[model samples]
Target: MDIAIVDADNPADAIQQVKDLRKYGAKLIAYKSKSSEELKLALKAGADIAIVDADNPADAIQQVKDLRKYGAKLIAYKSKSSEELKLALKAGADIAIVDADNPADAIQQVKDLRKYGAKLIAYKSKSSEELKLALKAGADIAIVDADNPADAIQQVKDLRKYGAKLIAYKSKSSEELKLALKAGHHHHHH
Candidate 1:
């Protein structure tokens, strides 16, 4: 029960895809937001997780409060470094999109930003292999673009040698989302 999709364009365009993925036999989160207004619409259309891209730090901080007001299950903030992510979470982000070459090692230096009590998503992983490396490195959500949906999904499934909670399928297409859910996921107690 683990997968997520960024909505198709906007809320109105995302309705069908959102509804389809909701019953895809997994807990699928839709990131269909650029603002509080979009988040509200997407939530009604079945999106639980929303996005707040960090541009101006002050505005970004306020965006979280706005998302919080809507009771969004998760607010994902786009960030680059551990320092940036730390600020995002402190300001109320549930998850932070992090682009790190070596996340485990970066966090090793960054000294446990997770102490803030949030999840880290390894973003824009180019392939299934990259996604595995990301998950292996302790990313809560491994986001990989579905370059070839079946191949990507298959390779990830075959490497099921570790516990995994969620994998972010970066394709906006409904077919890719369906294939991602079909691939599915499970976690080990460790």
Candidate 2:
């Protein structure tokens, strides 16, 4: 539990900072990619995952394979519908991010996305109820952002109890570090 994940910036800034984070012992540094050139910069800088844009993945698919064939660590594509998910996987995306809210949330997308075997990552899951709903809807992973880090600890417990495959705590703080003591997480974004 002594280990912790630190933040880095965009590829341009990450050009050096990502390497610095690696040197500092960050085993996983996720980089949100906007452009292929930017991804290449981060790729060289040693980013662990590229949150690639799913709208037009053609540009990235080629770049994705070029990385010593690292395979798709892509994190784009909203899994609100089966049709959208098909395109994402066709582009070789390994994961689909699902919005945990209504109008069209994980309930509509999770099952369909699984058809293509894409990993389902639940997002916007604010409360414990929503987290459970996300899990119940078959989200492969759940995201928790309790605004209050203190409350997040308890949410972490439920996120675990609800059959959470992975919990993404959306904050970085002393409370966040305390999560390691519970050994309940390896994912956070806030």
Candidate 3:
């Protein structure tokens, strides 16, 4: 599935972006929300998931509950420490995004997170190879970036071969979204 991460700080733009991408079968999610209020705004704006940063376990639990009440799934992002990751999961995060700064880290983190029974997303893959490694390491989703529409489409095609449920991160250009949709169309047809 194609998951588009939109900014919670810009509700109008984010909502519009979600609407446009929805035509292409993309799921909308709020990225890096600092508060439950921001998550609520994103949900109102048409997001399916709210990605929040957890500084405290108490707040994380409450935010997860609040967002769940709005019918939005919660993904805990920027979880650095093991304690933080544990808290995020215990607090009911649907998925926990962890940094995979390198291939080695990607493999290890994916394994560890899966073993801990937390749904995992391996974030910040700078290349298709990195994304593939994350998938091979057992990540449920691999987050990637591209410079342009063509590159993004190509990566989507290439990475799917590795069995990744991919998220095209920060796809700010409408052209990129269009091309991504086209790619999906062709990909399924083939």
- Name the regions of candidate 2 deviating beyond 4 angstroms: 1-27, 54-81, 100-104, 119-122, 148-154, 161-163, 170-190
- Say which prediction, candidate 1 or candidate 3, comes out ahead on lDDT: 3
lDDT of 1: 0.62
Q: For residue 112, what is the lDDT in candidate 1?
A: 54
Per-residue C-alpha lDDT of model 2 across residues 134-181, encoded as one tens digit per residue: 566666656566667688678777766666656654324334334553
Ranking of predictions according to lDDT: 3, 1, 2
Q: Cα deviation of 152 in candidate 1 (Å)?
A: 2.8
For candidate 3, lDDT tens digit of each residue in 1-190? 6666663246566666665555655554545566778667767656676777756767777888777666775555556554566667776678777753555755677678788887665555658887776677677776767766687777777876765655556645445666776677522211
Candidate 1 runs further than 4 Å off: 23-25, 100-112, 115-124, 158-161, 171-190
| Per-residue C-alpha lDDT of model 1 across residues 1-190, encoded as one tens digit per residue | 3556754765565766766566563366656455667666767767777777646777777888887876878888776567777777877788777665675554442335545555555445555565566555556776655566676676446435444556666434676656666778322221
- Model 3 TM-score relative to the real fold: 0.75
If the candidates were sorted by their TM-score against the true structure, best first, what order would they fall in? 3, 1, 2
Please name the candidate that would achieve the greatest TM-score relative to the true structure: 3
| RMSD for each of the candidates | 5.3, 6.3, 4.2
Q: Model 1 TM-score?
A: 0.71
Candidate 3 clash total?
Answer: 0
